[PDB]
Design an enzyme around this catalytic site. Structure first.
Site, short mmCIF file in Angstrom:
data_model
loop_
_atom_site.label_atom_id
_atom_site.label_comp_id
_atom_site.label_asym_id
_atom_site.label_seq_id
_atom_site.Cartn_x
_atom_site.Cartn_y
_atom_site.Cartn_z
N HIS A 1 0.79 -1.22 0.00
CA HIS A 1 0.00 0.00 0.00
C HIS A 1 0.83 1.28 0.00
O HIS A 1 0.28 2.39 -0.02
CB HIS A 1 -1.13 -0.04 1.09
CG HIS A 1 -0.71 0.38 2.47
ND1 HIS A 1 -0.73 -0.49 3.55
CD2 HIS A 1 -0.29 1.57 2.96
CE1 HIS A 1 -0.32 0.15 4.63
NE2 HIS A 1 -0.05 1.40 4.30
N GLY B 1 2.77 7.54 10.22
CA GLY B 1 4.09 7.24 9.69
C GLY B 1 4.73 5.96 10.22
O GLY B 1 5.89 5.69 9.89
N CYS C 1 3.44 2.78 9.59
CA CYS C 1 3.20 1.60 8.73
C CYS C 1 4.55 1.03 8.31
O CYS C 1 5.48 1.78 8.10
CB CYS C 1 2.28 1.85 7.52
SG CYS C 1 0.52 1.85 8.00
#
Lengths: 295, 297
Positions: free
Chosen positions: B43, B139, B141
């Site tokens: 993603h 931030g 992920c």
């Protein structure tokens, strides 16, 4: 809300093992110096000046992993020894030594014979002890905070107290609390709950979407203390209120309105409800920790 | 004896040396750099049909940074819910490592990172409902969870998203989700969670090893009778396999597992009467049988 520690890598590359006689523990290797508890040279009645003058450089065996570092100089500074070694640590981070106040938090890299085993986050209690998890072999383990790549070392572990909590010094070798490095009858003093931290943590709970424990009241600082001091809480001062400023501005809940919430929690309990998943009021996050883990 | 336990994380240094920042368009998050591959959530290419979104991307699409160092991407592919980016430089800090799939109840340390920079480390468990109760800000992920065994890092988790209840979902290091979640916004929700009975038992054993044993009794229970009570208090059913996992703790203390279950059943029914067990007023369920040994060494 997780009790998070600082990443330990910068400190791991500084841990070494220091042996004198049959006694081994940890040291901190920065640049060309190793710091360790002076009791590495040891009973109930040590005279450290008299024990140390009897040693030479080659009395100390310092090992980084399987590699010996040669001691080429030594001194005692309060309750620490500073050993000058022949090798400079290439992994020495940018660092400072700091003496923290009670109520402040820090990460502990727990180590055994110079090898890092685990990292955890704790608070210095108002009575200067720490509720840690230290096993035989952990002396010389250090606590620290990290700020933009600079390691601020604040704690080096020395001893366990009868109630099973821990005591140590700053990196100048000065004990936190009224403690001495020998085996005496010495005991942890009276302790309080860190009020400022509990309030920080109630702000954390509001920021993370929980408001159940709020109420319609306010309180003056004086009236708050008169209640909370009945529950073994640290007296709250205007300075502590001032520190809660950013959190108050961020949530729109005036500090003294939050104190009124806390007063009601103490008086009425939680009654089967939780805050941030906890059944008890948490006091090991500072206003600074909450800002770090929220914003 | 120990008066209490801390949740202890593994020392994070071996993992910190593997964290990088991955940017694709306006999206930035964390990657894991091992040898000449960077692993990150697929993603990163999004602001559905990843296969198609990825055709529109070339090596130059991906900006990879290890502190100040630019790692030129020279290959890319998708593996389940991960992107594998081949880079021009093999990480000189790659530890000995494995990729392992964690089971429900098991614990691991998470190195929370922000845009490639490690910010904190904490210990968590994989909940029975396949989520973790973590702390992941904007931030984070791509942050990873792991265990360390004699300097071998076993990676088991990569963070992908936060769910409506505030709990977190992610994948193993093959890119396969834990639990029913998908890397897209749906109405997806965590199923009801349960208490991890195995770990609760483990921590009762830890208490005993450390001299805190007021809760023990001279009676036993069958597994079925314990499970009737446990399940009523929203505890996971204990299986024979779980009973066997507790074997070493049970041998050490000479307390049969079903004897400990008898202790636990009384604790659930009668509560703790204001007493503490190992310095806690609740029954702790995030220390595994293995964690107990480690903290007792």
């Amino acid at each position: 809300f997780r009790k998070m520690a600082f990443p330990s890598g910068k400190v791991e590359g500084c841990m070494v093992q220091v042996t004198c006689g049959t006694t081994t523990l940890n040291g901190l290797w920065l640049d060309d110096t190793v710091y360790c508890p002076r009791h590495v040279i040891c009973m109930l009645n040590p005279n450290y000046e008299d024990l140390l003058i009897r040693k030479s450089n080659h009395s100390f065996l310092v090992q980084a992993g399987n590699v010996q570092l040669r001691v080429i100089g030594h001194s005692m500074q309060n309750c620490l020894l500073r050993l000058k070694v022949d090798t400079s640590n290439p992994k020495t981070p940018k660092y400072k030594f700091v003496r923290i106040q009670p109520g402040q938090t820090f990460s502990v890299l727990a180590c055994y014979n110079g090898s890092p085993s685990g990292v955890y986050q704790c608070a210095m209690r108002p009575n200067h002890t720490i509720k840690g998890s230290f096993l035989n072999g952990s002396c010389g383990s250090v606590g620290f905070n990290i700020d933009y790549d600079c390691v601020s070392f604040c704690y080096m572990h020395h001893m366990e107290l009868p109630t099973g909590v821990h005591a140590g010094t700053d990196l100048e070798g000065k004990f936190y609390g009224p403690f001495v490095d020998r085996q005496t009858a010495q005991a942890a003093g009276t302790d309080t709950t860190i009020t400022l931290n509990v309030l920080a943590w109630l702000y954390a709970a509001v920021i993370n979407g929980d408001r159940w424990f709020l109420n319609r009241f306010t309180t003056t600082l004086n009236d708050f203390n008169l209640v909370a001091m009945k529950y073994n809480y640290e007296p709250l001062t205007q300075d502590h209120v001032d520190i809660l400023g950013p959190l108050s501005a961020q949530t729109g809940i005036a500090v003294l309105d939050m104190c009124a919430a806390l007063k009601e929690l103490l008086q009425n309990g939680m009654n089967g409800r939780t805050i941030l998943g906890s059944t008890i009021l948490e006091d090991e996050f500072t206003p600074f920790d909450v800002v770090r883990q929220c914003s």
